[PDB]
Ligand binder design. Sequence first.
Ligand code: CB4
Length: 268
Amino acid sequence: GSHMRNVAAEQQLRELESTFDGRLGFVALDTATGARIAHRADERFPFYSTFKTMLSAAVLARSAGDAALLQRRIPYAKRDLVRYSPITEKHVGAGMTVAELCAATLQYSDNTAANLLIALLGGPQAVTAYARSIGDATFRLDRRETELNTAIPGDERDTTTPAAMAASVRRLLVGDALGTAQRAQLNAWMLGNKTGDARIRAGVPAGWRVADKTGTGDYGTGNDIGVAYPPDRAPIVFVVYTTMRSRNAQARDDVIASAARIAARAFV
Ligand SMILES: *[B]([O])([O])[C][N]C(=O)/C(=N\OC([C])([C])C([O])=O)C1=[C]SC([N])=N1
């Protein structure tokens, strides 16, 4: 890689942003060198479901000191279900274990699972407190699902910046924010994500393994965060936020894939 290639990538990101109505917020970090490719890196974006990575990390951190927490069963009823709860709607009554809730919220973006885990931790402010503990001064979780997805212009609730989220994803999945076993579990869950095949995954080479978490809001908006694990070189962190409002899902996913492709080109 080189600075010149990273500057070219940033120009290509600006050109990409001109292809849709809205803003692109992008950071990629090459962990072999620390090199960064950035576009609107310090602007706030609604994080939508990508916060579920921070949420699950906070649960895992608590589980490091409570060996039974991940097996604890949390009951809930049909009245507790919010919109888009494909896994939790199957287990109304006796409910699900904390580990199962984490897997559901990470791999299917299950919203009720997220709310149950937020309540487990003591409320949304506990997720913000966890972010502070790992060095993220920017992240703020103010609301629960599904209200946190409103994305009102100028509203800083339930936002972060691409730079702050990339730093947190790096520390969580590649670095020292969590203990060994918990870092590994977070990677395992995110490697098994079911919702992101058309986003960051679609922009990187086939042999790369991707651990990602998607987000989706109103009006065909979307985002994706994660780490790619190339087969014989160092991991690369990807954070792609947008305020894109699209006519269809394919257009939105193509922008996110393209942004990842631009950074992969610069770093290989
Ligand atoms: B998260 O951002 O993944 C939670 N997403 C949602 O609640 C919404 N949609 O869910 C679908 C489209 C199934 C998804 O792919 O995540 C959503 C749609 S509009 C809105 N405000 N939230």
